[PDB]
Amino acid sequence: YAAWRRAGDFIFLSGIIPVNTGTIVNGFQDVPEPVRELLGATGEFSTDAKQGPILAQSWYVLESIRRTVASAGGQMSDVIKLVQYFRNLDHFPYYSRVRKLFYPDQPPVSTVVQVSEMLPDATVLIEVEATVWLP
Amino acid sequence: AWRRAGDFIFLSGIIPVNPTGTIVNGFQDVPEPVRELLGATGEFSTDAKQGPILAQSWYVLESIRRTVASAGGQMSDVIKLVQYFRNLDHFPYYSRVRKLFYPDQPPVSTVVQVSEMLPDATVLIEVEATVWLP
Amino acid sequence: AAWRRAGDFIFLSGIIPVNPLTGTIVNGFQDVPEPVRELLGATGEFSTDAKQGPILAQSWYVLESIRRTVASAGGQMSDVIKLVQYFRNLDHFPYYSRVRKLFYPDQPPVSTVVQVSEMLPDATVLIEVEATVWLP
Amino acid sequence: AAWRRAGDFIFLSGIIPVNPLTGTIVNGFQDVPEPVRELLGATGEFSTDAKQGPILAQSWYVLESIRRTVASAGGQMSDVIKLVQYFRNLDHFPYYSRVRKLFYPDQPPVSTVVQVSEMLPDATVLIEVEATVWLP
Amino acid sequence: YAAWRRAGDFIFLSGIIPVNTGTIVNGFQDVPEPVRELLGATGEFSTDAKQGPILAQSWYVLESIRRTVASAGGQMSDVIKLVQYFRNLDHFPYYSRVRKLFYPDQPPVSTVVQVSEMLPDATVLIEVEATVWLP
Amino acid sequence: AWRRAGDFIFLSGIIPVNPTGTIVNGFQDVPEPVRELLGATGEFSTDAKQGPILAQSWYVLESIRRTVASAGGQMSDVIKLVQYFRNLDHFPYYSRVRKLFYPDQPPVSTVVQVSEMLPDATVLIEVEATVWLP
Amino acid sequence: AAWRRAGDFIFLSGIIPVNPLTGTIVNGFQDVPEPVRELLGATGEFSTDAKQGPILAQSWYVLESIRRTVASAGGQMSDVIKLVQYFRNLDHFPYYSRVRKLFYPDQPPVSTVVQVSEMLPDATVLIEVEATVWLP
Amino acid sequence: YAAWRRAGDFIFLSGIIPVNPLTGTIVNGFQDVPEPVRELLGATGEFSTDAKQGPILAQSWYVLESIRRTVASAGGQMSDVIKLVQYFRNLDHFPYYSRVRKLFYPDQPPVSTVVQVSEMLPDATVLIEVEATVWLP
Amino acid sequence: YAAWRRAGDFIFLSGIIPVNPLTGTIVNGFQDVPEPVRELLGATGEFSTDAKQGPILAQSWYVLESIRRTVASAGGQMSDVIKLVQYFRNLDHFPYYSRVRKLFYPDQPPVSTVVQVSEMLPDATVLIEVEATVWLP
Amino acid sequence: YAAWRRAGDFIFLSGIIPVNTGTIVNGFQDVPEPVRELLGATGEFSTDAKQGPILAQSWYVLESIRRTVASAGGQMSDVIKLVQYFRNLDHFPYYSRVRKLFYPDQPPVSTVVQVSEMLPDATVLIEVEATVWLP
Amino acid sequence: AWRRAGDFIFLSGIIPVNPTGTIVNGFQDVPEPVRELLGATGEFSTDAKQGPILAQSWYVLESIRRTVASAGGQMSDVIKLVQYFRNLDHFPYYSRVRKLFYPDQPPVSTVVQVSEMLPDATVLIEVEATVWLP
Amino acid sequence: YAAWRRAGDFIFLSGIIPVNPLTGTIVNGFQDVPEPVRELLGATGEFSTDAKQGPILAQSWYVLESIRRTVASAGGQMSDVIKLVQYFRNLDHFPYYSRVRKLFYPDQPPVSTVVQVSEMLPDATVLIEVEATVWLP
Numbered sequence A, E, J: 001y002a003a004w005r006r007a008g009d010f011i012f013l014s015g016i017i018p019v020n021t022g023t024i025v026n027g028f029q030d031v032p033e034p035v036r037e038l039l040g041a042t043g044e045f046s047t048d049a050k051q052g053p054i055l056a057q058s059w060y061v062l063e064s065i066r067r068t069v070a071s072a073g074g075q076m077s078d079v080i081k082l083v084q085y086f087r088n089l090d091h092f093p094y095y096s097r098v099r100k101l102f103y104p105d106q107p108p109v110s111t112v113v114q115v116s117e118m119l120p121d122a123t124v125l126i127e128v129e130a131t132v133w134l135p
Numbered sequence B, F, K: 001a002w003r004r005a006g007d008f009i010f011l012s013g014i015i016p017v018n019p020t021g022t023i024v025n026g027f028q029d030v031p032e033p034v035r036e037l038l039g040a041t042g043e044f045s046t047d048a049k050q051g052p053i054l055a056q057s058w059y060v061l062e063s064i065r066r067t068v069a070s071a072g073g074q075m076s077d078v079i080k081l082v083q084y085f086r087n088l089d090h091f092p093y094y095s096r097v098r099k100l101f102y103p104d105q106p107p108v109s110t111v112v113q114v115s116e117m118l119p120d121a122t123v124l125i126e127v128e129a130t131v132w133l134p
Numbered sequence C, D, G: 001a002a003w004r005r006a007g008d009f010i011f012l013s014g015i016i017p018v019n020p021l022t023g024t025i026v027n028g029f030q031d032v033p034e035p036v037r038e039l040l041g042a043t044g045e046f047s048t049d050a051k052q053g054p055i056l057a058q059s060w061y062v063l064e065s066i067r068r069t070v071a072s073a074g075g076q077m078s079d080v081i082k083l084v085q086y087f088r089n090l091d092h093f094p095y096y097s098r099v100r101k102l103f104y105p106d107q108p109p110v111s112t113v114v115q116v117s118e119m120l121p122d123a124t125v126l127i128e129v130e131a132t133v134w135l136p
Numbered sequence H, I, L: 001y002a003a004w005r006r007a008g009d010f011i012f013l014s015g016i017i018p019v020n021p022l023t024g025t026i027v028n029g030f031q032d033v034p035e036p037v038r039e040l041l042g043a044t045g046e047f048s049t050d051a052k053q054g055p056i057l058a059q060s061w062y063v064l065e066s067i068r069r070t071v072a073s074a075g076g077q078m079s080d081v082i083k084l085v086q087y088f089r090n091l092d093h094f095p096y097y098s099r100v101r102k103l104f105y106p107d108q109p110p111v112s113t114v115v116q117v118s119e120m121l122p123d124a125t126v127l128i129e130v131e132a133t134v135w136l137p
């Protein structure tokens, strides 16, 4: 399948998951140090163990969208629609803090659902599908 | 809430929440005239079981109508609905309510059962709308 | 409504594997023509086929429904730019993906894949695909 | 024993939805005559009907079995004073209750309704009704 | 359906559940204060939170039977048969304390089973079906 | 236990408990002659699986017989049985035992699977009897 | 390979209850000849038979498959020295054991019996038996 | 139950849960706490986020503040509470509780036990229960 | 394990469960307690009620009385037990335990923690386990 | 069925479970006192309650094999093959300590699986099927 | 590991463990040439799902081959396989791998789904082999 | 969190879990403990047995030894730890823990509470967590 595809003035992205190394993002360790403090890493062992994977995965998904979108000539505010899949909606507050770092001005249109699982296995906690309006 | 991109309008998934802060959960949360319309029965056991979903569905569809009115269109300009359920057994109720808003020809439709929607498990139905309005 | 044109795009209702002439859910290799069975990967061994037949046959009906729906409107698989694909069991993905390759020889679509609980009309539907077409 | 008179009362065995001429469990609108389908609320839409058909058809077979059993003994639905009604899923109640209204136009019976785990012969039976008749 | 129906010398009642206001009885608060002390309310927060709903629901069901029966010209000792449905038989001791307040002399015939659910939803913990012998 | 109301006698639901204080749970809790009758097999695995329900069923039915004798009737005056099971898979065993007490024509019958009966989960079968004895 | 001789022993593949001429899983008394039904313990009562029929019929097909497989190689049930027997529900054991008695009138085999989760081709197979034969 | 009890230089609290001593209400979200305490627990103003984080934040705060007020009614301050035993229905809630606990121990935190149990009184909607021990000569 | 232990003015008990130190029996109902203690726990004489309430009442009593007897073997009385930690398999059992606890603290009750856990030693039939702390100069 | 059967130079045993008195072995109490210390009984109440049933059942199964095998003229080292069924593989360390008492020299060939249940009910934790090579 | 008894050789149940101390769990734990052979696809989602079982199956079968070589035979001397799965849905993958080791005529076969094998739940397949080698 | 804390003659430890203060690793089997400590926990050398017993033995040892080392950093020895509260995910693991605890209290064991809870920090792979109280004048 195609990372993104252009159709008229719209760009459709595939659903994107937190993978790089072939690994699945699973904690702060997987992300650049400046970003950690930016996601809210506290330095406390137990707090970072819990919040870390969701924060890291959410960042990785959102940054991959930003890169994929740019590599087609757009910026984050060209994204009209987000469809967001979770294994656990109680993770939403964590996702929402990260999404704030990518949409500081006008937020995209949003669909948010809890599903069972996504590819390639159950450790994926978040998948985002993006739609871009860029003539 | 909504956004224009060329001739299309895209809506956020709408959930049956009062914008009371509360989740709609029964005939009492909808105006008297419409209860009769959703198929309210009067009898207590029946309306206890059907009322949450009918009310929730109507709430969501009407929210969609109004948002589309406030953008220039009516319901027939809604061409694609993505519809999320906690329980597909509710679908017959939902399809009854939707036939109220599309009496002629329905839109393109997607229907899946998912686990939960925001903001909690009492929400039985979410609809995401796509409008074509040049 | 099974499809609707808006501008350059055509939108398809989500498609499930229904035997459109018996009103029942496709359930195995018996629901597909003999030479298509070889194509889907049928092996001839009772148990292998009992196990793969449902997802493979269901995947064929969905994708071939999409192909025919698009063919009839003048378009092609390469015009079907986007697929949203709902599974009851992601373990069926390799099977589904073997079939999807058959339908997209040159221009693969953009893809989203999730496991949900269930689809219409009941729990024996294993795969559902929502297709989006760009055809000026 | 499907029924037994004791004094003024007649007692019926609990009744399940069995196709009495094929020995199988009623499973949808196909098991009922076409004009009765409209009466039960069939809509013509594939998925709505797939979902309501079983409980509605099962409810019809049970209630119509009771009606016929009572008719044959000289009585009427108004003589069927008491019903005990067992469900696998109380969410089916609105459907069942739509059908029960059909059988009781003037004198509704006394009613008990519970969700139990299961009934004979297997888990596809959705509804079972025990009827009690007063007929001097 | 019919609250009760007369057939010869017998009166059949419908199964009765704890509803009034359209609410489902769910604690001591739903019952008259003299009755609370009578059901065994302790005044302790945690004890009353647990015992309360079952005690209150049981009383409400039994009193509705007493009223329905009287409104047909009988008293509690005219009830021959009780069929009693529970979501949880571990609630039986609570039910049994209340039933003692309605049958102090000779107890009716009894059938007692745990079922899954009753109408109109899962918060109903007790439903009683009564049969009356009253020529 | 039982009560007269006109020509009918009504019985409390009977459970398979010794009136030892204990729940009957196997062939050992029933007299030697009847074991052969319930279909006891001699082999250990089989009788371990069938014995609880056969014994329990027999215990309950016999309790019903005696209560009906102590009121003037025999089994044929029992016209309606309501029968509660923890597991309908047990029904075939139960139906075998019941055919012992109604060799000719069975009574009017209701059969459901419920969750539990008193006084705990080891009780597999409860029967409520209704007698017609003018 | 359904069987293989090595020296004096013949080894059988595990055997499941498949209707070998319709490719489907045996499911009740209807899958067995009428006089064999009496032998298996059919009672004529709808619900008793609905409940015992599957395990009894499945047990007959498995054991009779073994008998025929062994008969065709010159041997007998007394030559079938060892059985490994897999169940989905050990509560079916008394039924299975009633049928196994039929096949072993003089020299019963050595026996292992376990409850596992599942067998091929799907979850409706209730019983599977692996047989080992000593036939010089 | 005794709210607290002295024994030598020690004061032992009963395990505390987020219930109104008045209403008898279980604390269920932001609406049950002082307005500026909300943005102090990290409320965002977003409906869905606040619905998800509200209950654990509110209950934690309510419990921790109870401890404070109780400790006050015996002469001591938050910093004399040296031991906490903290019981959760769901340890995924820990980061939320930890945010709140920092607000009460800005300087040096107490000794700490944290376990996930099945349930606390009076029902399953109670997400956190803390037991406090005080050293106060 | 040490039944109890002194440390300054304090005596700490091991968590106690309803087992016979003799038989090795787990207490399972009324039949395991002194006859007049039965109607003192609220036995009704009804078979089914007593089967349902018997085990929690009997186990609670057995545990609480153990505490008493232990506390006695060190010179103290029930009223010097100032802290209890109480562990349940099922908090729906709380009203039963609370009835019993009143019988041991008729005057002023102790400091109290109550949680529902999954299991206690030696098996799942143990419904209640109490841990006691004593102040006794 | 047949406790064991001879076929050429091989002896097949039936799967064997811990039964005597018709009871199912369920603790140290069911086994001879010298053996208890030999299985690792500590004397501590809680330890013996947990380890006891698996240790006792494993011993009973293995000793019954030794007796059945001897009663056909062989010794434990005539057993070539063990097939071992468990309700819970976390019991394996306990089984393995006991098996060491029966195979001190060369261990038999081994198949080990967790199954759901065995005959006659769920309290059986171990069943062993043995195969003997004894011309 | 194995034992001779007359003309037969009996093998211990083999599990897919490296003798690294680790459980094999994906294509990466098998040599490049064989990945192509097991049906490795290159695409990431597919190979993530098929790779554990194919790798595990191949690991187990090859272990069997080598053990049989180190005793004088080849694969065709393996006449009976007992095959244990955590999930029978894996069987098609397993049957593909096994067809690699028995290209002509398969051996006598037993296939059940069990709960777990040693040493933990990540092991998806265990095979017990019986060899006939005079 | 404070590792330990003094209050009068008492020292209270935070509940301890089997994590490396260095790596941040959760202890998962024999490979995480000193080699001769393995056969001291009862390692057999068998692959399958050691895989099954390794994690509980290793985690118990790691936790108990932490307690020791901590107690040392305040001047006391294992025998001044008079109270332990021990939390398990699975009490079937108790015999393993008990073996290990004997190695630290060869003479007279401490006061003891043992319960099965659902989970401990930081995740579900933690099988045992012990809380220690010390008397040390």
Ligand SMILES: [Ca+2]
Residues within 6 Å of the ligand: A090
């Ligand atoms: Ca949730």
Ligand SMILES: [Ca+2]
Residues within 6 Å of the ligand: C118, C123
């Ligand atoms: Ca469903």
Ligand SMILES: [Ca+2]
Residues within 6 Å of the ligand: D118, D123
């Ligand atoms: Ca069933």
Ligand SMILES: [Ca+2]
Residues within 6 Å of the ligand: E090
């Ligand atoms: Ca219960």
Ligand SMILES: [Ca+2]
Residues within 6 Å of the ligand: G118, G123
């Ligand atoms: Ca399956």
Ligand SMILES: [Ca+2]
Residues within 6 Å of the ligand: H025, H026, H027, H028, H029, H032
């Ligand atoms: Ca509130």
Ligand SMILES: [Ca+2]
Residues within 6 Å of the ligand: H119, H124
């Ligand atoms: Ca609860």
Ligand SMILES: [Ca+2]
Residues within 6 Å of the ligand: I025, I026, I027, I028, I029, I032
């Ligand atoms: Ca006892």
Ligand SMILES: [Ca+2]
Residues within 6 Å of the ligand: I119, I124
């Ligand atoms: Ca347990």
Ligand SMILES: [Ca+2]
Residues within 6 Å of the ligand: J090
């Ligand atoms: Ca396990």
Ligand SMILES: [Ca+2]
Residues within 6 Å of the ligand: L025, L026, L027, L028, L029, L032
């Ligand atoms: Ca490690």
Ligand SMILES: [Ca+2]
Residues within 6 Å of the ligand: L119, L124
């Ligand atoms: Ca967790």
